[PDB]
Amino acid sequence: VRKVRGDGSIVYLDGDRTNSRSTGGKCGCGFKHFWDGKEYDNLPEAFPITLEWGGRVVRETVYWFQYESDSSLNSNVYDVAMKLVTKHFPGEFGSEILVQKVVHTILHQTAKKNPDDYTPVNIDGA
């Protein structure tokens, strides 16, 4: 149980089992789960990625969102990498090289190409 937002919408922190029907699947739940203020047909994958810049080490885990029915909530290496670099190296010149590096790393990691395997993030609840 969680707090409510007045109108009746639960706070629904990351990974919660929402009340919306899962248009997609591969979850055995039949409901859209929650992540960063949005509803997704299935839990995102996750993999660590190293961000090296100015001698700074960052242990940031990228959350991939492939296998999404709406075809609009699916992840995007360019957007994801831009967000990561901006969040961890805001306003630093030459960050585009780091963004390209992160894009390549995410593409390689997500290119395991075993669509049968999914590895949902380990989150309690459905």
Binding site: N76, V77, Y78, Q100, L107, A111, K113
Partner: protein, 269 residues
């Protein structure tokens, strides 16, 4: 003046319209461009999976406007780079300048970038291309179409306004485009009416133009020893040169290009 026409690529209506607007309109109606005070776009940059008809698109648009077509293959650019012979780029443009109107097509603008992998994204050959494009008079109808299988590694300075500013995504052929490609490939060979040429295109989803060409070549090479059985036998050897993982890069690059345009709601008072 290529003999390739739009029917040889089939679909890509949006790309066809953009190419028309960028080539046919300035050449056919310079008066309207002068009236509206718009400078015609100097160039365009096709990006997409390998062997999807980028060269075919350039040749088709050249044929549509009946403009001379000059193809600068990637091996030529690498020859310039390895031998430090970038200066010849100048005369290459001069050639395109001489055969005006022209559609100067660079098959692989990223060939040099790929060949390099510590340095930046600037190289002597691409720098010469940039200098020629900047120093090119817009009065002469010379259009540069730079294909690229790696839209990111390409030098950003080439996408600057006044250059190959427009980026066009050439996706894998769809069902209609695949049917058109198969028909064009099987145009100089005797093919029996038994083969539908549409059901095949329907099944071979995600097959680049090169894949369809290889399938047809295998089928009619067996026939050299055409019928439905031989097409099926060759199709057993069919290979998808581009996998969905490769597609993702281009699909999501185009998606992020389109999402940046988030001012469509703008309405005047």
């Amino acid at each position: 003046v290529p003999q390739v026409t739009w029917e040889d690529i089939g679909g890509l209506e949006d790309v066809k319209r953009e190419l028309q607007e960028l080539v046919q309109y300035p050449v056919e109606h310079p008066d309207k461009f002068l009236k509206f005070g718009m400078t015609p776009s100097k160039g365009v940059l096709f990006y997409g999976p390998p062997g999807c008809g980028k060269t075919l698109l350039a040749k088709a648009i050249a044929n549509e406007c009946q403009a001379n077509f000059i193809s600068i293959k990637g091996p030529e650019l690498l020859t310039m780079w390895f031998g430090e012979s970038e200066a010849n780029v100048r005369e290459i443009f001069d050639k395109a300048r001489q055969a005006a109107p022209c559609v100067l097509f660079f098959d692989e603008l990223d060939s040099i970038a790929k060949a390099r992998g510590g340095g930046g994204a600037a190289d002597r050959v691409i720098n010469q291309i940039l200098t020629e494009m900047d120093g090119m008079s817009t009065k002469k109808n010379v259009f540069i179409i730079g294909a690229t299988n790696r839209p990111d590694i390409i030098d950003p300075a080439i996408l600057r306004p006044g250059r190959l500013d427009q980026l066009i995504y050439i996706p894998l052929p769809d069902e209609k485009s695949r049917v058109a490609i198969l028909k064009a490939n099987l145009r100089k060979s005797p093919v029996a009416k038994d083969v539908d040429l549409e059901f095949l295109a329907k099944m071979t989803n995600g097959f680049s133009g090169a894949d369809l060409t290889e399938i047809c070549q295998r089928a009619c090479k067996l026939a050299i020893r055409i019928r439905r059985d031989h097409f099926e036998e060759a199709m057993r050897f069919a290979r998808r040169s581009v996998s969905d993982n490769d597609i993702r890069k281009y699909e999501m690059f185009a998606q992020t290009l389109q999402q940046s345009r988030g001012f469509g709601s703008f309405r005047f008072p």
